[PDB]
Amino acid sequence: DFVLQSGQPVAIACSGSEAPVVRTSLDLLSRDLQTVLSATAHIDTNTGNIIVGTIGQSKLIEQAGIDISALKNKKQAFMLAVSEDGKLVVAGSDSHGTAYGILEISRLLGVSPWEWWADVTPEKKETFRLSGKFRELQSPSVEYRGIFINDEDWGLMPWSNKTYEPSDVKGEIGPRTNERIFELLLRLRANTYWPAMHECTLPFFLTKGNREAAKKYGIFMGASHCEPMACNAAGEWKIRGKGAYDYVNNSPAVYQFWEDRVKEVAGQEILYTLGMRGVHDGKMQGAKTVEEQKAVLDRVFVDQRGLLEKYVNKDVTQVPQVFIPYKEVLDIYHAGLQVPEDVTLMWCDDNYGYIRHFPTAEERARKGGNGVYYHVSYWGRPHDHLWLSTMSPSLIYQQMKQAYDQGIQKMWILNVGDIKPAEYQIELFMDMAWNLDKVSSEGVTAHLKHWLERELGTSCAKTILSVMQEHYRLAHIRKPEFMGNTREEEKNPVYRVVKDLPWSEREINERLNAYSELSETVEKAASKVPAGRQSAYFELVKYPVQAATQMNRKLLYAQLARHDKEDWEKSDAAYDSIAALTQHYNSLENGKWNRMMDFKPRKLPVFNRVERKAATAPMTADRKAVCQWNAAEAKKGNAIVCEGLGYESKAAEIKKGDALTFSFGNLKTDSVEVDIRLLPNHPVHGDKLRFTVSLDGAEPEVIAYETKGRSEEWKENVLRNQAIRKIVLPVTGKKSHQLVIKALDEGVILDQVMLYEVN
Numbered sequence: 218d219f220v221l222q223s224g225q226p227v228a229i230a231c232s233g234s235e236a237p238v239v240r241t242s243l244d245l246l247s248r249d250l251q252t253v254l255s256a257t258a259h260i261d262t263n264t265g266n267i268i269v270g271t272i273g274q275s276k277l278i279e280q281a282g283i284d285i286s287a288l289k290n291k292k293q294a295f296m297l298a299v300s301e302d303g304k305l306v307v308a309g310s311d312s313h314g315t316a317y318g319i320l321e322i323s324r325l326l327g328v329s330p331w332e333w334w335a336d337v338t339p340e341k342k343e344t345f346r347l348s349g350k351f352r353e354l355q356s357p358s359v360e361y362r363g364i365f366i367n368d369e370d371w372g373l374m375p376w377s378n379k380t381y382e383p384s385d386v387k388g389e390i391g392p393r394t395n396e397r398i399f400e401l402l403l404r405l406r407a408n409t410y411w412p413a414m415h416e417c418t419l420p421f422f423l424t425k426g427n428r429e430a431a432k433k434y435g436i437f438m439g440a441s442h443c444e445p446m447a448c449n450a451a452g453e454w455k456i457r458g459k460g461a462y463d464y465v466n467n468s469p470a471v472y473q474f475w476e477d478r479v480k481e482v483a484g485q486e487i488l489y490t491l492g493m494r495g496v497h498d499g500k501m502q503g504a505k506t507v508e509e510q511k512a513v514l515d516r517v518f519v520d521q522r523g524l525l526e527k528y529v530n531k532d533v534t535q536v537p538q539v540f541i542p543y544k545e546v547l548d549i550y551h552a553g554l555q556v557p558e559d560v561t562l563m564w565c566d567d568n569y570g571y572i573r574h575f576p577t578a579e580e581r582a583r584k585g586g587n588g589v590y591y592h593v594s595y596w597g598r599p600h601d602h603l604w605l606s607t608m609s610p611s612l613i614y615q616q617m618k619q620a621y622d623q624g625i626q627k628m629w630i631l632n633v634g635d636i637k638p639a640e641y642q643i644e645l646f647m648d649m650a651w652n653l654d655k656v657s658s659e660g661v662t663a664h665l666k667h668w669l670e671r672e673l674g675t676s677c678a679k680t681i682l683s684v685m686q687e688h689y690r691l692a693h694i695r696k697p698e699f700m701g702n703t704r705e706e707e708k709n710p711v712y713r714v715v716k717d718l719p720w721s722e723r724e725i726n727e728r729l730n731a732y733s734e735l736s737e738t739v740e741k742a743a744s745k746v747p748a749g750r751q752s753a754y755f756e757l758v759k760y761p762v763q764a765a766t767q768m769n770r771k772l773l774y775a776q777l778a779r780h781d782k783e784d785w786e787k788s789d790a791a792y793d794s795i796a797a798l799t800q801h802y803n804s805l806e807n808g809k810w811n812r813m814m815d816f817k818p819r820k821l822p823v824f825n826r827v828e829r830k831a832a833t834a835p836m837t838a839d840r841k842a843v844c845q846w847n848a849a850e851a852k853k854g855n856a857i858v859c860e861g862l863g864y865e866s867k868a869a870e871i872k873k874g875d876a877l878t879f880s881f882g883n884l885k886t887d888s889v890e891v892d893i894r895l896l897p898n899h900p901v902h903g904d905k906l907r908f909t910v911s912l913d914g915a916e917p918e919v920i921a922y923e924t925k926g927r928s929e930e931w932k933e934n935v936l937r938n939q940a941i942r943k944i945v946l947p948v949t950g951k952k953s954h955q956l957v958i959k960a961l962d963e964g965v966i967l968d969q970v971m972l973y974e975v976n
């Protein structure tokens with residue numbers, strides 16, 4: 218048996234030959250050993266009660282008689298075991314594996330990843346006791362997993378540059394901030410980072426300390442779909458480049474630009490993004506059509522792999538490489554572009570958490586594997602979601618589970634905005650990527666429960682679990698940031714005017730009240746929160762639920778007010794309340810997170826007090842449906858619920874060739890309007906997504922609902938998180954009818970069905 222008594226020091230055995238990442242994690246554990254146990258860690262090289270090392274690099278691993286074997290030639294893996302003498306042995310298959318083993322002990326001591334990052338103060342313990350029989354083995358489901366700090370102009374950049382690591386250089390997020398991010402990634406078992414790179418920010422590799430900090434923490438520096446060669450064009454090109462960022466006309470200067478960087482960074486953990494786009498987003502320069510944009514890349518790959526040959530590794534298949542066909546580059550891939558088989562292909566979601574492309578059997582068999590770049594934060598059309606992090610766990614789950622199952626297993630990268638306040642989604646994503654089976658065996662719901670129970674208490678989480686659930690479900694219906702019914706990047710000013718959502722007075726009141734109850738629950742449960750966890754509560758529960766409530770209030774009272782059904786002052790008050798909540802955020806823990814929260818990111822009209830004006834049109838009328846179903850109200854047919862997914866948490870997958878069968882009685886009127894609501898996801902194989910509707914055997918009507926590019930329908934789809942198909946059918950006038958919905962393609966997910974009489 219292994220026993221650590223609190224108040225007492227502890228000796229840790231670790232060879233001095235071990236990679237920086239091992240020593241860094243040791244520091245982190247010692248920090249936690251002190252916090253949790255009041256126990257000062259002493260690093261010897263020979264004698265310890267906790268022994269740590271990598272396979273065939275440490276004499277120490279051999280000399281305590283543990284059967285490591287399962288670890289031999291294996292990726293990022295560790296064994297934890299107690300030797301017969303009662304010592305804790307941490308045996309990693311490689312250096313990262315050793316690091317992750319050490320940090321597992323830190324999880325066992327009850328230290329949250331958000332210890333620092335959401336002030337989840339670890340509890341103190343009297344003793345820590347693991348069995349002589351305790352034996353854990355771990356390894357990652359996904360090989361590269363990481364985050365991208367992006368859209369940082371209104372949170373993480375000013376917070377770093379003025380509050381946490383105050384700097385006089387214009388947009389500096391310096392070494393000390395990055396060490397903090399890398400702790401978070403270590404504790405999340407992530408290994409990869411795409412640094413901030415917006416024009417407002419100092420490029421990572423042009424910041425003194427940053428590169429060396431990444432080496433200390435063992436993080437693969439990668440970069441985005443427009444940052445080819447560890448090279449942030451967005452910020453660096455205007456500093457260090459010459460002439461146009463154009464390979465067709467100015468390739469020598471572009472090549473040089475890349476080269477200098479590959480030179481300074483070649484003996485370092487880097488993931489090299491291949492290819493070429495614009496300075497930030499947009500077309501590449503110098504080519505117009507996809508046929509000319511293909512000729513370019515062919516030229517670009519050959520030279521880019523060239524530099525890698527010359528400064529990194531004579532065999533380039535030993536250099537890790539990614540190609541990311543995001544936005545218009547997906548088209549240029551699909552025009553038959555040849556990408557060398559060792560290069561990881563990185564698929565992209567549509568910025569609203571719907572993956573655009575799943576690997577064909579061919580792409581899947583490629584030696585370089587397949588990755589995904591996913592968004593829980595975004596700036597773009599039809600509207601930014603940058604303030605709160607409200608994407609449903611249920612949607613993240615179902616998309617990312619599908620991604621792994623469809624063979625996207627090499628590389629997962631999350632766009633996380635400012636990190637806060639997406640703490641929960643980030644950890645879900647990172648858990649998925651670390652151990653998919655564990656997350657899959659538990660609910661979506663069991664994951665969130667375990668998380669709230671861990672961060673708040675059991676007693677708080679008893680009241681709060683259903684609140685978070687309701688939070689994510691109402692945000693799925695319409696995010697806080699979408700409540701103005703406005704658009705961004707539309708090139709017409711009318712889409713910037715706040716305007717009615719197409720909902721009835723009844724639906725508005727119903728929504729207003731559901732939010733009221735949420736705010737009330739959150740207020741009451743506040744005093745049942747342990748003393749060391751009040752800041753985490755404001756950060757993780759109280760700010761997002763009450764922020765969201767007050768946004769709905771501001772915009773919904775405003776809508777009632779336009780139609781002379783409410784007083785405008787309630788809208789302003791709701792506005793004032795968001796302000797107050799944001800002041801509190803920015804003043805918690807002295808002002809630890811001062812500037813991290815901006816309730817007007819990018820100064821979008823939706824975040825302002827609402828312009829007072831009287832409606833011209835009337836309110837949407839409430840419309841009586843004859844029938845209203847979820848996928849399981851069906852008689853005949855099998856459809857597995859996607860756990861908490863859809864408008865009423867009951868969306869379900871109808872597998873290809875299966876059907877659901879709905880039944881209903883005697884109607885009036887000539888005809889029936891069938892209103893079918895589906896998850897607006899994208900085709901899993903092929904380009905299709907369709908279903909058939911059949912009233913009373915009557916020869917299936919064939920209905921498609923996939924979208925292409927960023928069309929008007931796709932814009933509608935992602936704002937409301939439903940594809941919508943209406944159909945009018947003739948009744949016979951039978952007295953008993955059946956409606957059969959059959960799936961023709963793979964990933965068809967039904968959410969709602971409504972009926973409506975009509976003539």
Ligand code: NI
Pocket residue numbers: 368372594603604605634635637638818
């Ligand atoms: Ni943000």
